[PDB]
From a paper:
An alternative way to improve HDR editing rates is through downregulation or inhibition of key factors involved in competing NHEJ and MMEJ pathways, such as [name] and DNAPKcs (NHEJ) or DNA polymerase theta (MMEJ). In this study, we leverage this functional screening system to assess focused libraries targeting the protein-protein interface of i53, an engineered ubiquitin derivative, and its binding target, [name]. Using targeted saturation mutagenesis at the i53:[name] binding interface and a screening process in primary human [name] (a cell type with intact DNA repair, DNA damage sensing responses and other cell stress sensing signaling pathways), we identified i53 variants that introduce stabilizing interactions with [name] and are more potent than i53 at increasing HDR editing outcomes in [name]. Using these classifications, we determined that the addition of i53 variants results in an increase of HDR by specifically reducing NHEJ events but not MMEJ nor other types of outcomes, consistent to their role as [name] antagonists.
To understand the molecular basis of the improved activity and binding of the de novo i53 variants identified in our screens, we solved crystal structures of each variant bound to [name] (S2.2, S2.3, S2.4, S2.5 and S2.6). We observed that the L67R change enables a new 2.8 Å H-bond with D1550 of [name], and that L67H forms a network of inter- and intramolecular H-bonds, including a water mediated H-bond to S1554 of [name] and an H-bond to D64 on i53. The intermolecular H-bond to D64 could help lock the i53 loop conformation observed in the crystal structure and lower the entropic penalty for binding. The new interactions identified at position 67 were also present in the crystal structure for T12V.T14H.L67H and T12Y.T14E.L67R. For T12V.T14H.L67H, additional stabilizing interactions were observed at positions T12V and T14H: a water mediated bridge between T14H and Y1502 and Van der Waals contacts between T12V and [name]. Interestingly, the T12V mutation alters the polarity of the interface, resulting in displacement of a water molecule and formation of an intermolecular H-bond between D1521 and Y1523 in [name]. The T12Y mutation forms additional Van der Waals contacts at the protein-protein interface. These analyses demonstrate that each amino acid change in the variants selected from our screen form stabilizing interactions at the [name] interface, resulting in tighter binding and validating the use of this screening approach to identify gain of function protein variants.Fig. 2 i53 variants display additional molecular interactions with [name].
Residue numbers in the entry:
A (entry chain B): -2 to 74
B (entry chain A): 1485 to 1603
Write the structure that this text describes.
């Protein structure tokens, strides 16, 4: 696949990394955060560079993913 | 004698290395680490690099203002009343990054293990 590396900063400050595809939905990303960090999706509000990422869009919908050399840091809030 | 030392360490087998401090030798080959990001956990000593600061010309991964991590090279450091900043060059351009904005990929950290690995 064409998977890509992103980072996520939790509320505690802990940074994790995930492999995602440009076609993953925000809900799918929250499900991956859940799988890795146990944070229920009902607790999870994601943003990139201060813009809310909403359920039912993909990462590509937000123009977040670039090339494989630049890894966006999402933040939970 | 490793307790209180600044390190860069990873907490998963394929993960990145993050800055932190050793707070205790806990045995079973592990050390309790308080990461600058706040996470604390017991990490394997093999996954700890005893280098502080990260040396000149090290290839690192740094968080730019645009909220993307990408590779760069350390070109200098400044300690401004407690805080360490790194000067990191990317495609010819130098910017200053806080210590906690500078991390190492698996390969980048692996490059430093023979010189700075704990053990």
């Amino acid at each position: 696949p064409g998977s890509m590396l992103i980072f996520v900063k939790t509320l505690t400050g802990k940074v994790i990394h995930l492999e995602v595809e440009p076609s993953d939905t925000i809900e799918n990303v929250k499900a991956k955060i859940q799988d890795k960090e146990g944070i229920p999706p009902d607790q999870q509000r994601l943003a990139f560079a201060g813009k809310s990422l909403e359920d039912g869009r993909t990462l590509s919908d937000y123009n977040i993913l670039k090339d494989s050399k630049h890894h966006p840091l999402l933040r939970l809030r | 004698s490793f307790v209180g030392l600044r390190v860069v360490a990873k907490w998963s087998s394929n993960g990145y290395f993050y800055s932190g401090k050793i707070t205790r030798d806990v045995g079973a080959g592990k050390y309790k680490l308080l990461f600058d990001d706040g996470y604390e956990c017991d990490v394997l000593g093999k996954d700890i690099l005893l280098c502080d600061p990260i040396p000149l010309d090290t290839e690192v991964t740094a968080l730019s203002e645009d909220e993307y991590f990408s590779a760069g090279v350390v070109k200098g450091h400044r300690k401004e009343s407690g805080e360490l900043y790194y000067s990191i060059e990317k495609e010819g351009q130098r910017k200053w990054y806080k210590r906690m904005a500078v991390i190492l990929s698996l390969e980048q950290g692996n490059r430093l293990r023979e010189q700075y690995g704990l053990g």
